[model samples]
Target: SMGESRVILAFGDALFAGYGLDKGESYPAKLETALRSHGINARIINAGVSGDTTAAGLQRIKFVLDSQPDKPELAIVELGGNDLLRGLSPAEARQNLSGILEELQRRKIPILLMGMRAPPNLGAKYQREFDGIYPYLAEKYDAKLVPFFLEAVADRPDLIQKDHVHPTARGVEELVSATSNAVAKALPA
Candidate 1:
């Protein structure tokens, strides 16, 4: 039943890669642990790159895919945060993300698009455009949308690290819970 095995490929930046947390406490690792506990025999490949943008992530997709013998059952993409932070245009981010999604769709891969909102300093127009990419791509590709990956941790000083960006250990637990539920729903029994 190895063919029936499910694999999750998580591609993104530091947040998905777990910057502040310990090695085994990263979101992908926690996700793997959580899925096993839930009776889902699945493997999670942490393809997260620290400080990577949409373009960077797009460039690395093929490399990550090449690492796995079988195509992933699900692709959890959490990019564009670095792009937005670096003052990259929302249009550019959208184009990059769209291309990524298109490639995955062409490969018949299921995806969970994780959205990230830009800082308020980026202005409302930029914020809307940047944040809109997730839902738009998810709708166009019929992929599942997590809305915002760090919904519970964002803006919560106690949950985030000193930089107000990365999540703390406790915050990782919360993220694992949310991400696990979403992945469970995306995968089959």
Candidate 2:
């Protein structure tokens, strides 16, 4: 048996993929480092793919789960960033996310949804609709939700790289600390 080790799947877009940061600097990588340090017995699978939209995530989620060595204790989903950039409608993003959540729920995998927010420059309508997607899905599926996964580093220039979207290694550190508690509590008791 794998003993008490807990398997986690971090499935999402570039934020999950690590973007420009070094291989080990990705969110999933840092998160695993923090979890292990805390004696939480966590092993996170970095299923992030850069440039992926919510639709892309859903398309590959089945294979992601099937390829896992064992059923994951939790699935952390953080998509829809690209959807906002690509000008995809909020309804479509929501639908894509719903499909992903439905699949995970069917497998009884507890979910920790990392919510994304549309930039204010996108206008109020888009912001309102897109911002509501995560909490709405969270309520619908009873999944844990972090309203804005990048809350800790979003406004900090020191933590962000030149691209202004992806986080630097320091930024990754901020994320792990901000969300690790939710992750720890989300595990099946």
Candidate 3:
């Protein structure tokens, strides 16, 4: 029915964690508000950790799943930014994210694969490989994809934090608005 409960796990790095933002200002927090305002009973858990690589996320997935009071109906995979930042191999990042997606699929949970881009300093070759991971996995798993998690905020200096990596509270609100449509569509009716 319409009242069916829904839970989402916003899993990734500091972006989803609201890095420099205060409580209730993170994308996940704002996402919950967006969902509830649409009349869906939803709980969006923020499972983001600062400086988390896709490798770490792969390792932590099981623990997060085990810890959830209600098994998540959907999970937003938001890793890979830290991988890009650290000049890690795109192949390794792809493999780690693939493993994470495989595990979530094994659990029969839907996923919203959030993509990230490599900085121009990383070179075009690296950028190509890093940016391709999301669509590749999304097609393989038939998961919804958010092309770039930081779409509007990334290019705008004012929308970002002083660190220039994380988004500010205002940016997160824009993120919620930008990504919420895909999220809402992914939820079961």
Candidate 4:
């Protein structure tokens, strides 16, 4: 349809992991369906792991890449939420994410860097610094950016899991819809 079958690696933490949903209810799965329906053939691999931080994602990225038979055409990076939740340094999170992005760039894979926001409880300075990480890296790497992955469900309790950190299946559906366009646009023509 749009060239050879393309692969997209959805790399992140619980948000991308579909923490409280069934196997097929994950955002990656739903995203694949959405992309295909929109006429872009794609396979969105879920490389998400619950509780993963930017550092953890950085460490395991190579393993994920090596395990795949073909390098992915695009990668949707959705990390740093756990880093914010754990009160880690924003600078360190930025560095770790940058490392991940650099490796992906080195492989010539396009990326859609999904941004995350620090909770208000973390204070203004931390929030500001944390929120700045995504745009900065997106600009540096020239990766497509989804300003905030949870923008569609963040304030809606009905869409969030009981943990208040993860999204429910319905929430993931919303996410898939909200992010599908960006994902489609990032796909190879």
- Candidate 2 per-residue lDDT, tens place, 67-124, comes to 9888999999999999998889999999999999999999999999998989876789
In candidate 3, stretches whose alpha carbon ends up further than 4 angstroms from where it belongs are 1-4, 164-189
Ranking by TM-score: 4, 2, 3, 1
Better of 3 and 4 by lDDT: 4
Estimate the lDDT of model 4: 0.91
Q: How accurate is candidate 3 locally (lDDT)?
A: 0.90
Error of 3 at 179 (Å): 45
Please provide, for model 4 over 1-189, each residue's C-alpha lDDT reduced to its tens digit, 9 standing for 90 to 100. Answer: 646778889998987899989978999988888887788888788999999999999999999998998789899999999998789999999999999999999999999999898887889999999999999999999999999889999879797777556776798999999999999999998
Q: In model 4, which regions exceed 4 Å deviation? A: 1-4, 164-189
2 or 3, greater by lDDT: 2
Give the Å shift of residue 71 in candidate 1: 1.8
lDDT of 1 by residue, 12-105 (tens): 8998889989879999898888887777877788888889989998787877887788789999999998997789988888889888888888
Per-candidate TM-score against the hidden true structure: 0.81, 0.83, 0.83, 0.83
lDDT at residue 167 of model 1 (Cα atoms): 70
Model 3 earns a TM-score of 0.83
lDDT measured at residue 3 in model 4 versus the true structure, 0 to 100? 68
lDDT at position 38, candidate 2: 78
